[PDB]
Coordinates of all heavy atoms in Angstrom, one line a residue:
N1 N 40.3 10.4 31.6 CA 39.4 11.4 32.1 C 38.7 12.1 30.9 O 39.3 12.4 29.9 CB 40.1 12.5 32.8 CG 40.9 12.1 34.0 OD1 40.4 11.5 34.9 ND2 42.2 12.4 34.0
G2 N 37.4 12.3 31.2 CA 36.6 13.1 30.2 C 35.7 12.2 29.4 O 35.5 11.0 29.7
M3 N 35.1 12.7 28.3 CA 34.2 12.0 27.5 C 34.9 11.1 26.5 O 34.3 10.2 25.9 CB 33.3 12.9 26.7 CG 32.6 13.9 27.6 SD 31.4 14.9 26.7 CE 32.3 15.8 25.5
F4 N 36.2 11.3 26.1 CA 36.8 10.5 25.1 C 37.9 9.6 25.5 O 38.6 9.8 26.5 CB 37.4 11.5 24.0 CG 36.3 12.4 23.4 CD1 36.3 13.7 23.8 CD2 35.4 11.8 22.6 CE1 35.3 14.5 23.2 CE2 34.4 12.7 22.0 CZ 34.4 14.0 22.3
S5 N 38.0 8.5 24.7 CA 39.0 7.5 24.8 C 39.2 6.8 23.5 O 38.2 6.7 22.7 CB 38.7 6.4 25.8 OG 38.9 6.9 27.1
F6 N 40.3 6.2 23.2 CA 40.5 5.3 22.1 C 40.2 3.9 22.6 O 40.7 3.5 23.6 CB 42.0 5.3 21.6 CG 42.3 6.5 20.7 CD1 43.5 7.1 20.9 CD2 41.4 6.9 19.7 CE1 43.9 8.1 20.0 CE2 41.7 7.9 18.9 CZ 43.0 8.6 19.0
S7 N 39.2 3.2 22.0 CA 38.8 1.9 22.5 C 39.8 0.8 22.3 O 39.9 -0.2 23.0 CB 37.5 1.5 21.8 OG 37.6 1.6 20.4
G8 N 40.6 1.0 21.2 CA 41.6 0.1 20.8 C 41.1 -0.8 19.7 O 41.7 -1.8 19.3
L9 N 40.0 -0.3 19.0 CA 39.4 -1.1 18.0 C 40.0 -0.7 16.7 O 40.4 0.5 16.5 CB 37.9 -0.8 18.0 CG 36.9 -1.8 18.6 CD1 37.5 -2.5 19.8 CD2 35.7 -1.1 19.0
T10 N 40.1 -1.6 15.7 CA 40.7 -1.3 14.4 C 39.7 -0.7 13.5 O 38.5 -0.9 13.7 CB 41.3 -2.6 13.8 OG1 40.2 -3.6 13.6 CG2 42.4 -3.3 14.7
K11 N 40.1 0.0 12.5 CA 39.3 0.5 11.5 C 38.2 -0.5 10.9 O 37.1 -0.1 10.7 CB 40.2 1.1 10.4 CG 39.5 1.8 9.2 CD 40.1 3.1 8.9 CE 39.3 3.8 7.8 NZ 39.7 5.2 7.7
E12 N 38.6 -1.7 10.7 CA 37.8 -2.7 10.1 C 36.8 -3.2 11.2 O 35.6 -3.4 10.8 CB 38.5 -3.9 9.6 CG 39.5 -3.7 8.5 CD 40.8 -3.0 8.9 OE1 41.2 -3.0 10.1 OE2 41.4 -2.4 8.0
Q13 N 37.2 -3.3 12.4 CA 36.3 -3.6 13.5 C 35.3 -2.5 13.7 O 34.1 -2.9 13.8 CB 37.1 -3.8 14.8 CG 37.7 -5.2 14.9 CD 38.7 -5.3 16.1 OE1 39.5 -4.4 16.3 NE2 38.8 -6.4 16.8
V14 N 35.6 -1.2 13.6 CA 34.5 -0.2 13.8 C 33.6 -0.2 12.5 O 32.4 0.0 12.7 CB 35.1 1.3 13.9 CG1 36.3 1.2 14.9 CG2 35.5 1.9 12.6
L15 N 34.2 -0.6 11.4 CA 33.4 -0.7 10.1 C 32.4 -1.8 10.3 O 31.2 -1.6 9.9 CB 34.4 -1.0 9.0 CG 34.3 -0.1 7.7 CD1 35.5 -0.3 6.9 CD2 33.0 -0.5 6.9
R16 N 32.7 -3.0 10.8 CA 31.7 -4.0 10.9 C 30.8 -3.8 12.1 O 29.7 -4.3 12.1 CB 32.3 -5.4 10.9 CG 33.2 -5.8 12.0 CD 33.6 -7.3 11.8 NE 32.5 -8.2 11.9 CZ 32.7 -9.4 12.6 NH1 33.9 -9.7 13.1 NH2 31.6 -10.2 12.7
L17 N 31.2 -3.0 13.1 CA 30.4 -2.7 14.2 C 29.2 -1.8 13.7 O 28.1 -2.1 14.0 CB 31.3 -1.9 15.2 CG 31.2 -2.1 16.7 CD1 31.1 -3.5 17.0 CD2 32.4 -1.4 17.3
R18 N 29.5 -0.9 12.8 CA 28.5 -0.1 12.1 C 27.7 -1.0 11.2 O 26.5 -1.1 11.4 CB 29.3 1.0 11.3 CG 28.4 1.7 10.3 CD 28.9 3.2 10.1 NE 30.3 3.4 9.8 CZ 30.9 3.3 8.6 NH1 30.2 2.9 7.5 NH2 32.2 3.5 8.6
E19 N 28.2 -1.6 10.2 CA 27.4 -2.4 9.2 C 26.6 -3.5 9.8 O 25.4 -3.6 9.6 CB 28.3 -3.0 8.1 CG 29.2 -2.0 7.4 CD 28.5 -0.8 6.6 OE1 28.1 -1.0 5.5 OE2 28.5 0.3 7.2
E20 N 27.2 -4.3 10.7 CA 26.6 -5.5 11.2 C 25.8 -5.2 12.5 O 24.9 -6.0 12.8 CB 27.7 -6.5 11.5 CG 27.2 -8.0 11.4 CD 28.3 -9.0 11.7 OE1 29.4 -8.9 11.2 OE2 28.0 -9.9 12.5
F21 N 26.1 -4.2 13.3 CA 25.4 -4.0 14.5 C 24.8 -2.6 14.7 O 24.0 -2.4 15.6 CB 26.4 -4.2 15.7 CG 27.0 -5.6 15.7 CD1 28.3 -5.7 15.2 CD2 26.3 -6.7 16.2 CE1 28.9 -7.0 15.1 CE2 26.9 -7.9 16.1 CZ 28.2 -8.1 15.6
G22 N 25.0 -1.6 13.8 CA 24.5 -0.3 14.0 C 25.1 0.5 15.1 O 24.6 1.5 15.6
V23 N 26.3 0.1 15.6 CA 27.1 0.8 16.6 C 28.0 1.7 15.8 O 28.8 1.2 14.9 CB 27.8 -0.1 17.5 CG1 28.7 0.7 18.5 CG2 26.9 -1.0 18.3
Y24 N 27.9 3.0 15.9 CA 28.6 4.0 15.1 C 29.7 4.6 15.9 O 29.5 5.2 17.0 CB 27.7 5.1 14.6 CG 26.8 4.7 13.5 CD1 25.9 3.7 13.6 CD2 27.0 5.4 12.3 CE1 25.1 3.3 12.5 CE2 26.2 5.0 11.2 CZ 25.3 4.0 11.3 OH 24.6 3.6 10.2
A25 N 31.0 4.5 15.5 CA 32.1 5.1 16.1 C 33.0 5.6 15.0 O 32.8 5.3 13.8 CB 32.9 4.0 16.9
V26 N 34.0 6.5 15.3 CA 34.8 7.0 14.3 C 35.9 6.0 14.0 O 36.3 5.3 14.9 CB 35.5 8.4 14.7 CG1 34.4 9.4 15.0 CG2 36.4 8.3 15.9
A27 N 36.5 6.0 12.8 CA 37.4 5.1 12.3 C 38.7 4.8 13.1 O 39.4 3.8 13.0 CB 37.9 5.5 10.9
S28 N 39.1 5.8 14.0 CA 40.2 5.7 14.9 C 39.9 4.9 16.2 O 40.8 4.7 17.0 CB 40.7 7.1 15.2 OG 39.6 7.9 15.5
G29 N 38.7 4.4 16.3 CA 38.3 3.7 17.5 C 38.0 4.7 18.6 O 37.8 4.2 19.8
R30 N 37.9 6.0 18.4 CA 37.6 6.9 19.4 C 36.1 6.8 19.7 O 35.2 6.7 18.9 CB 37.9 8.3 19.0 CG 37.9 9.3 20.2 CD 37.7 10.7 19.6 NE 36.3 11.0 19.4 CZ 35.9 11.5 18.2 NH1 36.8 11.8 17.2 NH2 34.6 11.8 18.0
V31 N 35.8 6.8 21.0 CA 34.5 6.5 21.6 C 34.2 7.7 22.5 O 35.0 8.1 23.3 CB 34.7 5.1 22.2 CG1 34.3 5.0 23.7 CG2 34.0 4.1 21.4
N32 N 32.9 8.2 22.5 CA 32.5 9.1 23.5 C 31.6 8.4 24.4 O 30.6 7.8 24.1 CB 31.6 10.2 22.8 CG 31.1 11.3 23.8 OD1 30.9 11.1 25.0 ND2 30.8 12.5 23.3
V33 N 32.1 8.3 25.7 CA 31.5 7.6 26.8 C 30.1 8.1 27.1 O 29.3 7.4 27.5 CB 32.6 7.7 27.9 CG1 31.9 7.4 29.3 CG2 33.6 6.7 27.7
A34 N 29.8 9.4 26.9 CA 28.5 10.0 27.2 C 27.4 9.4 26.2 O 26.3 9.7 26.4 CB 28.6 11.5 27.1
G35 N 27.8 8.7 25.2 CA 26.9 8.1 24.3 C 26.3 6.8 24.9 O 25.4 6.1 24.4
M36 N 27.0 6.3 26.0 CA 26.6 5.0 26.6 C 25.6 5.3 27.7 O 25.7 6.3 28.4 CB 27.8 4.4 27.2 CG 29.0 4.1 26.2 SD 30.5 3.5 27.0 CE 31.5 3.4 25.6
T37 N 24.5 4.5 27.8 CA 23.6 4.7 28.9 C 23.5 3.3 29.6 O 23.9 2.3 28.9 CB 22.2 5.1 28.4 OG1 21.7 4.1 27.5 CG2 22.3 6.4 27.6
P38 N 23.1 3.1 30.8 CA 22.8 1.8 31.4 C 21.9 0.9 30.5 O 22.1 -0.3 30.5 CB 22.2 2.1 32.7 CG 21.8 3.6 32.7 CD 22.8 4.2 31.8
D39 N 21.0 1.5 29.7 CA 20.2 0.7 28.9 C 20.9 0.2 27.6 O 20.7 -1.0 27.3 CB 19.0 1.6 28.4 CG 17.9 1.9 29.4 OD1 17.7 1.0 30.3 OD2 17.4 3.0 29.4
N40 N 21.7 1.0 26.9 CA 22.3 0.4 25.7 C 23.7 -0.3 26.0 O 24.2 -0.9 25.0 CB 22.6 1.6 24.7 CG 23.6 2.6 25.0 OD1 24.4 2.5 25.9 ND2 23.6 3.8 24.3
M41 N 24.2 -0.2 27.2 CA 25.5 -0.9 27.5 C 25.6 -2.3 27.2 O 26.6 -2.7 26.5 CB 25.7 -0.7 29.0 CG 27.1 -0.9 29.5 SD 28.3 0.2 28.7 CE 27.9 1.7 29.7
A42 N 24.7 -3.2 27.5 CA 24.8 -4.6 27.2 C 24.7 -4.9 25.7 O 25.6 -5.6 25.2 CB 23.7 -5.4 27.9
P43 N 23.8 -4.4 24.8 CA 24.0 -4.5 23.3 C 25.3 -4.0 22.7 O 25.8 -4.5 21.7 CB 22.7 -3.8 22.8 CG 22.1 -3.0 23.9 CD 22.5 -3.9 25.1
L44 N 25.8 -2.9 23.3 CA 27.0 -2.3 22.9 C 28.2 -3.3 23.1 O 28.8 -3.7 22.2 CB 27.3 -1.0 23.8 CG 28.1 0.2 23.3 CD1 28.5 0.9 24.6 CD2 29.3 -0.1 22.5
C45 N 28.3 -3.8 24.4 CA 29.4 -4.7 24.7 C 29.2 -6.0 24.0 O 30.3 -6.5 23.5 CB 29.3 -4.9 26.2 SG 29.8 -3.4 27.0
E46 N 28.0 -6.5 23.7 CA 27.8 -7.7 22.9 C 28.4 -7.5 21.5 O 29.1 -8.4 21.0 CB 26.3 -7.9 22.8 CG 25.8 -9.0 23.7 CD 24.3 -9.0 24.1 OE1 23.5 -8.4 23.3 OE2 24.0 -9.5 25.2
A47 N 28.1 -6.3 20.9 CA 28.6 -6.0 19.6 C 30.1 -6.0 19.6 O 30.8 -6.6 18.7 CB 28.1 -4.7 19.1

């Protein structure tokens, strides 16, 4: 419930998500769901 969840992504996975794809998340894999829109969802999931 709410805007936050741990995605289950490792520190290195969030690090290359940022460097290689421009998807920015905090090192703990915490994700704010309100940053997702129907438009960016498919590039996000691809990454």
Side-chain angles (χ1 to χ4, degrees):
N1 300 306
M3 309 187 296
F4 301 107
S5 282
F6 278 142
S7 54
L9 259 37
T10 63
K11 181 133 183 166
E12 297 73 25
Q13 277 167 322
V14 316
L15 231 166
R16 60 179 294 221
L17 221 44
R18 166 153 48 86
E19 306 299 279
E20 206 181 315
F21 304 98
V23 177
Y24 283 62
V26 304
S28 43
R30 197 200 78 228
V31 128
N32 180 333
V33 164
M36 302 171 182
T37 63
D39 289 324
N40 68 16
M41 195 61 76
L44 208 202
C45 294
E46 258 156 27

